From a paper:
The Fc region of the immunoglobulin (IgG) antibody, which is the focus of this study, can have interactions with Fc gamma receptors (FcγR) and first subcomponent of the C1 complex (C1q) that mediate antibody-dependent cellular cytotoxicity (ADCC), complement-dependent cytotoxicity (CDC), antibody-dependent cellular phagocytosis (ADCP), induction of secretion of mediators, endocytosis of opsonized particles, as well as modulation of tissue and serum half-life through interaction with the neonatal Fc receptor (FcRn). We describe here the functional and structural characteristics of three novel silent Fc designs: huIgG1 sigma ([name]σ), which is a variant of huIgG1, and huIgG4 [name] ([name]σ1) and huIgG4 sigma2 ([name]σ2), which are variants of huIgG4. Crystal structures and simulations of these Fc variants reveal altered conformational preferences within the lower hinge and BC and FG loops relative to wild-type IgG, providing a structural rationalization for diminished Fc receptor engagement.
The structure of huIgG4σ1 Fc includes residues A237-L443 and G236-S444 for chains A and B, respectively, that were modeled into the visible electron density. The lower hinge residues in both chains of the huIgG4σ1 Fc structure and in chain B of the huIgG4σ2 Fc structure adopt a kinked conformation like that described above for huIgG1σ. The results of our in vitro and in vivo studies demonstrated that huIgG4σ1 and huIgG4σ2 are more silent than huIgG4 PAA. Given that all the mutations for these variants were localized to the lower hinge region and that structurally the dispositions of the BC and FG loops were identical to those observed in structures of wild-type huIgG4 Fc, these mutations could function either by directly disrupting hinge:receptor interactions or indirectly by altering lower hinge backbone conformation. Structures of huIgG1 in complex with FcγRI and FcγRIIIa have shown the importance for L235 in receptor engagement. This residue was mutated to alanine in both huIgG1σ as well as huIgG4σ1/2, and this mutation likely has a direct effect on receptor engagement. All Fc variants demonstrating this kinked conformation commonly share mutation of a conserved proline at position 238 and have an altered ability to engage Fc receptor. The Ab1 huIgG4 PAA shows a first transition at 69.5 ± 0.1 °C, while the huIgG4σ1 is at 62.0 ± 0.2 °C and the huIgG4σ2 is at 61.2 ± 0.6 °C, suggesting that the huIgG4 PAA is more thermally stable than its variants.
Residue numbers in the entry:
A (entry chain B): 236 to 444
B (entry chain A): 237 to 443
Write the structure that this text describes.
């Protein structure tokens, strides 16, 4: 049953800051009530590690169980491309299913980050859009946030990365703000976190001309 | 089971009275010895027989693929009728059904804005012209670029992204030589969507 194990990477922001906790997550679905205990062995570059935390089976609303195992990884190990392998078995049975994941391969490329004010036509509205164009980046793992006056501005949404013709990625993030706050000269800033940035972070600010 | 896919009509087809929208049922991983793949088609549960099915074509992995196309009425798709494909093999009992319809909900008009390149990008040989399309529902949309009446090809568009208010937005990025932008050429983003007048709007961008 190999189409029922899924292995997920850490969130981009978690791998870029050593104070955060990046985790690789091995999920087993379609677990039967007649299945003996689900068991996990984890390996980093083929060497077994023992710090994973496995949660008890959780029943889903389709008469199956789901079992999750979570492994904390060393930021540097993930970014250096180490391979993470989850081996799933049932207690007292011999067979197993194995899944592997690692960061995408290829030379990392630094994102270029541009901020764009609202279209003049949008200035007629009650709220305006501030746009952050992030391009030229590789791999696609990236985090984008906005702030103003120290505080996180959370009325924003960000597109998934999109693959460009030269093999790098781009995306846009759109922050929506009251026109009054923009008209008043408030400074807004787009922060971007990516492994190929110096100190893994950059920011670009934008305010009324 | 996972080997059948059912695709919606193209955004432009449902929106132009001159075009013909259709839904497309596709079956893959069809073994060489498999009996004839058959299709039954239903519109809101009612069987229809006007579909047109194409014979099995081999793929690089030595499996086969079969395709059935059903023409749909514009109003049927736009009114939210459900299209069901039922795939089976001649003389065998099982069947696999897939259904598709337009997302339900009050349609909402796309607000379309064009943005010039960032001043910081102006130092490069090529620059980015941006078209923001937001506030639209459902997500079916077509976005194109032109200059001086003529289609431009060097652009990429993000998929529609679900916004916190339940509508969608996207961005389209047209890459042009710095010299063409500085020459004062006029660029235009065009958007087709059901909640636009004439189903079409165009916004210009120039220096
Ligand atoms: C019974 O129910 C269960 C449970 O479902 C739930 O309950 C039922 C009752 C319904 O209510 C249902 O709606 C509920 O969701 C069913 O279980 C599901 O089983 C299917 C398979 O049958 C699984 O399908 C895969 O989904 C993957 C994506 O999963 C994520 O996204 C969906 C939403 O889009 C979420 O619902 C999932 O939970 C996953 O969400 C992610 O979860 C991660 C782990 O927790 C999160 O990461 C962690 O997050 C924490 C913070 O929270 C930390 O940050 C950690 O550091 C971090 O690790 C992550 O953030 C979160 N994301 C989101 C967006 O929420 C698909 O990737 C996968 O597709 C692959 O495989 C397909 C083949 O099946 C193939 O078609 C795809 O192309 C893709 O193939 C892969 O492609 C890549 C490259 O393209 C290759 O490299 C791969 O090799 C290749 N793999 C292949 C080919 O195998 C599947 O579609 C589904 O995930 C699972 N749901 C849950 C909740 O577990 C079950 O099926 C039901 N049984 C029945 C009906 O019989
Ligand atoms: C053997 O080979 C064959 C052939 O593949 C080719 O050869 C091999 C060797 C490879 O090199 C391969 O790269 C080659 O392409 C393999 O066949 C493939 O099989 C996989 C499954 O394993 C199929 O994957 C699904 O793809 C869906 C999208 O497919 C489209 O987009 C891809 C681009 O990546 C194209 O390749 C496809 O052709 C599809 O393209 C679309 O085609 C439509 C009709 O042909 C077009 O619409 C029509 O267009 C015409 C134009 O002439 C008219 O305008 C008509 O009016 C119009 O209707 C359409 O434009 C076109 N799109 C584009 C972009 O061009 C995925 O959607 C799908 O994912 C879903 O399903 C997964 C499993 O069920 C699931 O895990 C996913 O999460 C996802 O789930 C769905 O999600 C949506 C929303 O996200 C929900 O709405 C659904 O409910 C939900 N379903 C669920 C949950 O069940 C699949 O990943 C692949 O399409 C197929 N290729 C081809 C060419 O058919 C075969 O697998 C090989 N065998 C092996 C390896 O063993």
């Amino acid at each position: 049953g190999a189409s029922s194990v899924f292995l997920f990477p850490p969130k981009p922001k978690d791998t870029l800051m050593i104070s955060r906790t990046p985790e690789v997550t091995c999920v087993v679905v379609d677990v039967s009530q007649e299945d003996p205990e689900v068991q996990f062995n984890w390996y980093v570059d083929g060497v077994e590690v023992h710090n994973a935390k496995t949660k008890p089976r959780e029943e889903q609303f389709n008469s199956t169980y789901r079992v999750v195992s979570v492994l904390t990884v060393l930021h540097q190990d993930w970014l250096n491309g180490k391979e993470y392998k989850c081996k799933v078995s049932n207690k007292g049975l011999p067979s197993s299913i194995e899944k592997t994941i690692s960061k995408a391969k290829g030379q990392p490329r630094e994102p270029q980050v541009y901020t764009l004010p609202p279209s003049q036509e949008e200035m007629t509205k009650n709220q305006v859009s501030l746009t952050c164009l992030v391009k030229g980046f590789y791999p696609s793992d990236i985090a984008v946030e906005w702030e103003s006056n120290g505080q996180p501005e959370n009325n924003y949404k960000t597109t998934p990365p999109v693959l460009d013709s030269d093999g790098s990625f781009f995306l846009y993030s759109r922050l929506t703000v009251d026109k009054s706050r923009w008209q008043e000269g408030n400074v807004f800033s787009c922060s971007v976190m990516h492994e190929a940035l110096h100190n893994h972070y950059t920011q670009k600010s934008l305010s009324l001309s």
